[PDB]
Write a structure and sequence with these properties.
The structure is a homodimer.
Chain A: E1 5-8, E2 15-18, H1 47-64, H2 71-87, H3 94-106, E3 121-124, H4 131-146, E4 154-157, E5 169-170, E6 180-182, E7 188-190, H5 195-203, E8 218-221, E9 228-230, E10 239-241, E11 256-258, E12 262-263, E13 267-270, E14 273-275, E15 280-281, E16 284-285, H6 286-295, H7 303-309, H8 321-339, E17 344-345, H9 347-365, H10 372-375, E18 399-401, H11 406-409
Parallel strand pairs in A: 3-4, 16-17
Antiparallel strand pairs in A: 1-2, 4-15, 5-8, 6-7, 8-9, 10-11, 12-15, 13-14, 13-18
The structure holds protoporphyrin IX containing FE (HEM) (2 copies), ligand KL1 (2 copies), 5,6,7,8-tetrahydrobiopterin (2 copies) and zinc ion (ZN).
One copy of the ligand Cc1cc(N)nc(CCc2cc(CCCN(C)C)cc(F)c2F)c1 binds near residues 170 and 278 of chain B.
PDB class: oxidoreductase/oxidoreductase inhibitor
Keywords: inhibitor complex, OXIDOREDUCTASE-OXIDOREDUCTASE INHIBITOR complex
Assembly: dimeric
Chain lengths: ~425, ~400
């Protein structure tokens, strides 16, 4: 591989030079003959596999604190090596846990929000043993992160994988989501994306109120045991009713959304260790709600009903009636969040911040992996600065990875 | 491997086998993806490429292994020997042109790929000849608004010292002028090319929508200027169905999109002048041409007339104005009976095209970064379509600007 790689911005002419790609680890999925850059998703480790992964991470940690080669560096290397020899694993210091989590965010190529990567609150939950403990930890996370609408980014890290039969997992894909319900007639109440998970929850004991915006219970798995259900206290679930600054009829659609986006189905890999329950949360970019959640045809799919209330001609696609309503729906979501003093960022501000971040990373770090397909917002793409920015995608570690759905792998006791 | 692509809205899964036949590079490796990078002979390299192309041509007319096939491979081998190159048969020229379009990963319009009028211009020797051939192209493809796809193929490269090149990047574009106060009149993307036209004799009217002259290079000689007869240049005043003040913005665009800076490669041969044209997708004009900050950049003005609050971005004033600008373009071409397609129709057509290519051909190389329209992405069906990108030949490739390589 060539040592220097250039990226250009076609709107400003700015050329950046990437050397960080030389530290790439796992596979993109691409080859020199095929590019999989639009593919969404393109047993444990052995002593011999773990040794070099830990050393790589420990080296990198001591490089960052400007102690590379020090006595504390070599002593940590030897302690780690001795520990892998006697137990086939090792335990991270708190300092290394925090560094690793912040860098998995920093390295998350699909995240436009990374300007904030070093302001992450890390909750060490590695002493947790039961699903009730997991509930306690997550409740405290949600309350801290919500902060009465002054949202603060945070991660709670549960115990790492051991033999693969004792995994901690949050079975929810996100900590806060609305249920969806299949009716006998084929229609769907609530969020259609969550019909499968809702059905699991119901069979597990949950009593569904069967509304359009029912907050799902937490389904928590500790130490490989069968998952258990918990209701998040509703006063911890901050929500925003959606209204429009001009269209007084917009509130009559009964739309609302929750304030905290909190991914809980991903795996955090640090130094070869696997943290299979590591829920992390930030704050929303408006398009995640106004464009995808509300206007995807497989989701709440409100474009038609907004278009009718807007009295648009909906017989020709070339009237752009869909595009017009999409803008108005996204004006309402940003307006409703700002009026309630709940942190949100529009797609224009977040992509300008990301460009500034990317440029600083190239300056100070030698690069910034970014997945263009995910960084570019789902509306108005080319009037945001990221559209015109060339990006290199590669995988650095520590990182967040996908993992199988726990109901597909769990062995029921 | 047989690779699978999933549509995340419909859950339709297709299976790609066609990628097994690529061999040109993508630019990516297992460790670094370059999917968002815009720009990632001799007798001995030439025959295997000629062979593969003849093989796929005779396989496409279902006469693989025919005597005609055999005699063609021998005919081509002898000619590469005596002459160091070879000439395509007319049937191979047309087949190669249509398949370079069929294989263009970045083109959302490929449902039309086999309906292409091919103009053989390989007998051309002078810039006057090129001008004639180009005028006939423009007149043919424009067709009084009922646009028809077309390509004009000038002589292939011989030694690189005698290239045919259209120096315009597109046959019809508007000039751009640097103003003394620092701002730009016209199209800022064409400032330098306009300066090269002026420095060579073109007298500019110095307006906002001056059709540029043609700058044509024949057989490696210096380029010569020509004005396309104005009755050949179809233009559309832009107006809005609801906002009667929109026509007062003074906006217009040309009807015919015609790329003239690319290289057509067929069986190892290189056609450095191959102007090709189709019809516009509305967003090409309304989003990029009009609202790119480095182009006509009219968002601020439209939002002014719309009285929108332009104090904070979160009012989405740019997004509102952008939609109204794109309504006007579609309404104007439609009112003037000039072929245009909106990004909803075009992307729907492309999904259907992919479905067709997967069944009958085993895949469709496609560049998600280019296929998804520059506005309202996720409400078009291609946003949710996984695509595999790989390089099939014949193909259109980029080439250096001639003002950076031509020896005067
Ligand atoms: C603080 C403000 C943040 C903003 C504005 C932000 C923005 C975004 C957006 C818009 C996406 C795309 C999500 C989608 O389309 O489904 C995303 C993805 C992602 N973000 Fe961030 N994010 C933030 C915080 C965080 C934090 C705190 C972390 C981790 C510690 C993180 C890690 C990720 C990851 C891993 C993804 C990829 C998810 C996937 O592949 O499905 N983000 N971010
Ligand atoms: C017939 C209607 C057509 C439509 C609606 C259409 C649509 C498009 C669009 C929207 C793009 C992206 C343009 C840009 O962003 O610069 C594109 C690119 C492209 N088109 Fe098509 N096109 C059509 C016809 C054709 C024809 C006739 C050919 C060749 C014979 C062709 C070959 C290509 C190629 C090679 C590109 C990539 C250009 C580049 O990399 O700059 N297209 N097309
Ligand atoms: C930390 C953080 C900050 C921020 N702004 N956004 C995110 C993503 C939040 C999120 C993502 C998805 C995607 C589901 C999978 N997708 C393929 C459909 C669904 C949600 F309900 C949700 F809340 C995370
Ligand atoms: C056959 C065909 C059909 C169709 N619909 N569109 C096209 C593109 C036409 C086109 C493209 C560009 C891009 C310039 C480079 N870009 C990176 C800024 C500039 C133009 F003036 C122009 F006319 C071709
Ligand atoms: C097929 C395609 O990769 C898929 O639709 C992706 C495209 N880009 C995306 N970008 C974001 N931020 N989120 C998504 O869910 C997607 N979906
Ligand atoms: C950086 C990025 O590759 C560049 O902006 C691309 C993105 N996608 C595009 N898609 C189309 N159709 N046309 C373009 O000019 C571009 N520009
Ligand atoms: Zn790639």
């Amino acid at each position: 591989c060539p040592r220097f790689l250039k990226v250009k911005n076609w709107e400003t002419e700015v050329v950046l030079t990437d050397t960080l790609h030389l530290k790439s680890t796992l596979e993109t999925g691409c080859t020199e003959y095929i590019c999989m850059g639009s593919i969404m998703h393109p047993d444990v480790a052995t002593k011999d596999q773990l040794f070099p992964l830990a050393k790589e991470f420990i080296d990198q940690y001591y490089s960052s604190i400007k102690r590379f080669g020090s006595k504390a560096h070599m002593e940590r290397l030897e302690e780690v090596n001795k520990e892998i020899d006697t137990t086939s694993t090792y335990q991270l210091k708190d300092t290394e846990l925090i560094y690793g989590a912040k860098h998995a965010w920093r390295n998350a190529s699909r995240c436009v929000g990374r300007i904030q990567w070093s302001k992450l609150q890390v909750f060490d939950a590695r002493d947790c043993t039961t699903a009730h403990g997991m509930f306690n930890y997550i409740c405290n996370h949600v309350k801290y992160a919500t902060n009465k609408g002054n949202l603060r980014s945070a991660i709670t890290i549960f115990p790492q994988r051991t033999d693969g039969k004792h995994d901690f997992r949050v079975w929810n894909s996100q900590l806060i989501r609305y249920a969806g319900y299949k009716q006998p007639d084929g229609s769907t109440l609530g969020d259609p994306a969550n019909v499968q998970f809702t059905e699991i929850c119901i069979q597990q004991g949950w009593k569904p109120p069967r509304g359009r915006f029912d907050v799902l219970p937490l389904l928590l798995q500790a130490n490989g045991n069968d998952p258990e259900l918990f209701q998040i206290p509703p006063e911890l679930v901050l929500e925003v009713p959606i209204r429009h600054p001009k269209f007084e009829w917009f509130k009559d659609l009964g739309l609302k959304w929750y304030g905290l986006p909190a991914v809980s189905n991903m795996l955090l890999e640090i130094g070869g260790l696997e943290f299979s329950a590591c829920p992390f949360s930030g704050w929303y970019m408006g398009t995640e709600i106004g464009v995808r959640d509300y206007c995807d045809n497989s989701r709440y799919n409100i474009l038609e009903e907004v278009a009718k209330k807007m009295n648009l001609d909906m017989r020709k696609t070339s009237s752009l009636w869909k595009d017009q309503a999409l803008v108005e729906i996204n004006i309402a979501v940003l307006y409703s969040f700002q009026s309630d003093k709940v942190t949100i960022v529009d797609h224009h501000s977040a992509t300008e911040s990301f460009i500034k971040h990317m440029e600083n990373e190239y300056r100070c770090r030698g690069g910034c992996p970014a997945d263009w397909v995910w960084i570019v917002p789902p509306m108005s793409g080319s009037i945001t600065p990221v559209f015109h920015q060339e990006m290199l995608n590669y995988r650095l570690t520590p990182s967040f990875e996908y993992q199988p759905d726990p109901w597909n792998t769990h062995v029921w006791k």
